[PDB]
Design a protein around this motif. Structure first.
Motif, PDB file in Angstrom:
ATOM      1  N   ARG E  43      45.332  38.193  47.024  1.00  0.00           N
ATOM      2  CA  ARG E  43      44.682  37.230  46.628  1.00  0.00           C
ATOM      3  C   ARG E  43      43.165  37.853  47.167  1.00  0.00           C
ATOM      4  NH1 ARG E  43      44.709  33.780  51.823  1.00  0.00           N
ATOM      5  NH2 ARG E  43      46.856  33.393  51.602  1.00  0.00           N
ATOM      6  N   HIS E  44      42.871  37.947  48.117  1.00  0.00           N
ATOM      7  CA  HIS E  44      41.792  37.594  48.795  1.00  0.00           C
ATOM      8  C   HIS E  44      41.024  39.003  47.471  1.00  0.00           C
ATOM      9  CE1 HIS E  44      39.120  41.897  49.489  1.00  0.00           C
ATOM     10  NE2 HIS E  44      40.132  42.494  48.742  1.00  0.00           N
ATOM     11  N   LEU E  45      41.740  40.203  47.131  1.00  0.00           N
ATOM     12  CA  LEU E  45      41.596  41.077  46.043  1.00  0.00           C
ATOM     13  C   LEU E  45      40.863  40.090  44.569  1.00  0.00           C
ATOM     14  CD1 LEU E  45      41.880  42.394  42.943  1.00  0.00           C
ATOM     15  CD2 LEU E  45      41.425  43.907  45.310  1.00  0.00           C
ATOM     16  N   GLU E  46      41.836  38.976  43.994  1.00  0.00           N
ATOM     17  CA  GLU E  46      41.688  38.539  42.940  1.00  0.00           C
ATOM     18  C   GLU E  46      39.532  37.678  43.725  1.00  0.00           C
ATOM     19  OE1 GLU E  46      44.465  35.634  42.429  1.00  0.00           O
ATOM     20  OE2 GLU E  46      44.116  33.977  43.501  1.00  0.00           O
ATOM     21  N   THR E  47      39.505  36.980  44.815  1.00  0.00           N
ATOM     22  CA  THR E  47      38.458  36.319  44.591  1.00  0.00           C
ATOM     23  C   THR E  47      37.516  36.504  44.417  1.00  0.00           C
ATOM     24  OG1 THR E  47      38.450  36.450  46.842  1.00  0.00           O
ATOM     25  CG2 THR E  47      39.060  34.383  46.529  1.00  0.00           C
ATOM     26  N   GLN E  48      37.566  38.544  45.110  1.00  0.00           N
ATOM     27  CA  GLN E  48      36.385  39.492  45.089  1.00  0.00           C
ATOM     28  C   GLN E  48      36.617  39.769  43.784  1.00  0.00           C
ATOM     29  OE1 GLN E  48      35.395  41.688  46.525  1.00  0.00           O
ATOM     30  NE2 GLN E  48      35.151  43.867  45.921  1.00  0.00           N
ATOM     31  N   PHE E  49      37.583  39.622  42.979  1.00  0.00           N
ATOM     32  CA  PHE E  49      37.125  39.456  41.017  1.00  0.00           C
ATOM     33  C   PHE E  49      36.498  38.633  40.266  1.00  0.00           C
ATOM     34  CE2 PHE E  49      38.521  38.871  37.372  1.00  0.00           C
ATOM     35  CZ  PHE E  49      38.478  39.647  35.988  1.00  0.00           C
ATOM     36  N   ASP E  50      36.370  36.994  40.967  1.00  0.00           N
ATOM     37  CA  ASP E  50      35.953  36.192  40.666  1.00  0.00           C
ATOM     38  C   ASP E  50      34.625  36.536  40.718  1.00  0.00           C
ATOM     39  OD1 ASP E  50      38.216  35.614  41.054  1.00  0.00           O
ATOM     40  OD2 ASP E  50      38.057  34.022  42.043  1.00  0.00           O
TER      41      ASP E  50
END
Lengths: 81, 49, 290, 49, 50, 50
Positions: E43-50
């Protein structure tokens, strides 16, 4: 064996075997059983067995043969003993 | 030996049905703490005859 | 290019074999081979019509050698795992509506006719290569040939009198003929040579009056061919000493035994080659019987 | 057609085609590959095919 | 002005995917644990992506 | 595809399925050439989780 100590007893074990599975609603599934019964035999280590555990639905089935061909297709093997 | 066999034999962790009966599982799976929040009570405590 | 009229009925496509001194036609050679009929028997089944789906030509720049391969593999002499990197299917590129790739007359597949090199009329190759594409997929688990059973037929065809071949039944007769120092293997090396192709292209592309007429004229050239092969898979092959000659004997003709380790008096059959001759026999056979 | 295999008759015959392999088919080549040791061990399955 | 059709899309990818990580169960303590936390890293990886 | 040999048998391993989704999204025209070596890796993941 004393009729009593036998039935009474047997019944204990009988009521112990708990075949892993995933109940459904389709009015055609069945169960293959044998294969399963066997996945239980060993404690779910022999791959076919290590298959059912997390993936239990694998066992239900409708086409008497597709039943198995499913198992193979997935873990890819010539034969299961 | 014998006791811990009939018993761990009947699921090592249960979860609960809709009508609230207790549905034990089958395997005698271990039990991690990260598995604490989620329908899966440790089974020893079930306190069911 | 070059038409046909009959095909195998043409100068350069003459099948000979050489025996003892000069090279003679196999028709005459066969008549120099007799039987021992064992107290057994073998009824002939009914070859299952070949799986329709012809393999996928597959992209592969470069003419590939087809005649040599098909034959090197059947009456090979040491061809190992034949259906790996096997191109036989590349022989489906020819079967099509108006493809370009022509079947060279040396048994090579070219893509586009080229500077000074004959090639069968794309008219008939379209009928041959049409079916033998199949011969490509013999390793595909779900298509593999019959095999062991398919030999009931190679045999009554090779042996059996005009009479047995009519009622199916026929003892498993054992072949003996007059050998001449390592004769079977040599008979064979000589055959790997024939321009088989020229035969098949004619086997399946002749209308009728012509086709049946030729089937009969060429049964002799053909039979010698199954024979060199049936021996590849025959129990024991033993040599018999007699007065002065050696009457060589084939123990059981038309009873594939699955023999697979290198013999000597013959050509071994690695298991793959084995399924293949299996595949080859079925198509060519299902076809011989119009 | 058949030229009477050079080995069938009894006349020596200096000169005759030899199929020799070119410079592009080195053999006995010691060819390198990347081996990957499956991680886990505890996972690596042995039994059942 | 503020949505980013592109990165928001990857976001759903971390769910259907993350969701896939829940259907997949196990049989171990190591497997049971890391699965929770990767549900985490994932998940963190995704906000990291946003 | 610089063949990535994996087993997909430890929940933490979605990491690899993700390499591709992230990768295919990032450079899809490039990824398109190799959809095969990969379709090749994925069914295995499937044989495992599905």
């Amino acid at each position: 064996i004393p009729a009593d100590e036998l039935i009474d007893n047997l019944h204990s074990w009988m009521r112990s075997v708990h075949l892993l599975h995933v109940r459904s609603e389709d009015n055609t599934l069945r169960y293959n059983w044998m294969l399963g019964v066997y996945a239980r035999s060993t404690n779910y280590t022999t791959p076919v067995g290590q298959l059912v555990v997390n993936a239990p639905a694998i066992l239900n089935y409708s086409n008497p043969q597709d039943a198995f061909n499913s198992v193979f297709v997935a873990l890819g093997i010539d034969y299961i003993d | 030996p014998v006791e811990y066999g009939i018993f761990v034999q009947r699921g090592a962790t249960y979860t609960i049905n809709a009508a609230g009966e207790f549905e034990f599982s089958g395997r005698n799976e271990k039990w991690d703490q990260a598995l604490y929040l989620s329908e899966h009570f440790p089974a020893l405590f079930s306190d069911v005859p | 290019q070059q038409p046909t009229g009959g095909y195998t009925t043409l100068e350069q496509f003459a099948f000979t074999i050489r025996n003892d001194g000069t090279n003679a036609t196999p028709t005459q050679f066969l008549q120099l081979l007799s039987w021992e009929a064992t107290e057994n028997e073998l009824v002939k089944k009914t070859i299952p019509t070949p799986e329709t789906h012809l393999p996928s030509a597959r992209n592969v720049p470069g003419n590939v050698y087809i005649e040599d391969a098909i034959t090197q593999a059947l009456f090979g002499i040491s061809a190992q795992n034949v259906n790996a990197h096997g191109y036989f299917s590349r022989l489906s590129a020819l079967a099509l509506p108006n493809t370009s790739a022509r079947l060279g007359l040396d048994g090579v597949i070219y893509n586009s006719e080229t500077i000074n090199i004959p090639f069968y009329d794309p008219a008939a190759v379209a009928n041959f290569a049409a079916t033998y594409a199949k011969l490509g997929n013999a390793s595909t688990p779900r298509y593999r040939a019959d095999m062991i059973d398919i030999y009931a037929h190679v045999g009554l065809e090779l042996a059996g009198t005009d009479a047995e071949r009519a009622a199916g039944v026929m003892p498993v007769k054992r072949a003996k003929f007059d050998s001449w120092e390592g004769s079977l293997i040599s008979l064979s090396r000589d055959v790997v040579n024939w321009k088989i192709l020229a035969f098949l292209i004619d086997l399946c592309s002749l209308e009728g009056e012509a086709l049946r007429a030729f089937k009969t004229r060429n049964r002799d050239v053909f039979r010698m061919m199954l024979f060199i092969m049936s021996t590849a898979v025959a129990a024991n092959v033993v040599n018999r000493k007699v007065t002065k000659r050696v009457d060589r004997v084939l123990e059981y003709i038309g009873v594939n035994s699955m023999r697979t380790a290198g013999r000597t008096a013959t050509i071994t059959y690695d298991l793959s080659r084995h399924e293949f001759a299996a595949k080859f026999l079925q198509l060519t056979f299902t076809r011989w019987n119009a | 057609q058949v030229g009477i295999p050079k080995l069938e008759v009894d006349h020596i015959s200096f000169s005759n085609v030899v199929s020799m392999m070119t410079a592009n088919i080195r053999t006995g080549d010691d060819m390198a590959v990347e081996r990957v040791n499956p991680d886990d061990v505890r996972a690596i399955n042995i039994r059942n095919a | 002005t503020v949505t980013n059709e592109f990165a928001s899309r990857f976001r759903t990818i971390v769910a259907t995917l993350a969701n896939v990580v829940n259907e997949r169960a196990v049989q171990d303590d190591m497997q049971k644990a890391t699965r929770s936390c990767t549900k985490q890293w994932l998940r963190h990886l995704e906000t990291q992506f946003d | 595809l610089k063949k990535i040999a994996e087993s997909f048998e430890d929940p933490s391993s979605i990491v690899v399925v993700l390499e591709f989704i992230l990768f295919a999204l990032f450079f899809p025209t490039e990824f398109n050439r190799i959809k095969g070596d990969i379709q090749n890796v994925l069914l295995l993941f499937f044989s495992r989780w599905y």
